[PDB]
Design a protein around this ligand. Structure first.
Ligand SMILES: [Zn+2]
Length: 134
């Protein structure tokens, strides 16, 4: 919720359909209240298409959101201690090709559901390319 926050992404690449990839992201320097929590996840954008939310996790209570397109293939997990989130993407399809952006929102109560709208996220990573060939 800090100002010199940096989201650091890792992973990505290109694979043939059916294979798997993993993304990772670290929210460095984000300071926040013991009475609050916040959400982290990935949006993706394909060329000429609107960005869309992929999967998100609320820190602390591990609540998750997955877009219907990825349920059963994608898994988002959080490492409390290493301050990272990661996204395991199995059975990848051509429709999954995109730039995937890590994101985090301003801190808020645990009572709020994990956030998944692009307008609800204020910190963004630079992007990591994902390509699934035929
Ligand atoms: Zn949130």
């Amino acid at each position: 919720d800090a100002s010199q926050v940096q989201l650091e992404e890792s992973g990505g690449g290109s694979v043939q359909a059916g294979g798997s990839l993993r993304l990772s992201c670290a929210a460095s320097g984000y300071m926040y209240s013991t009475y609050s929590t916040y959400c982290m996840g990935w949006f993706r954008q394909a060329p000429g298409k609107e960005r869309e939310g992929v999967a998100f996790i609320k820190r602390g209570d591990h609540s998750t959101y997955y877009t219907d397109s990825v349920k059963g293939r994608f898994t988002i997990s959080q490492d409390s201690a290493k301050n990272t989130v990661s996204l395991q993407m199995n059975n990848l399809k051509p429709e999954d090709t995109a730039i995937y952006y890590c994101a985090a929102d301003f801190a808020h109560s645990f009572l709020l559901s994990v956030h998944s709208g692009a307008g609800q996220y204020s910190y963004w990573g630079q992007g990591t390319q994902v390509t699934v060939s035929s």
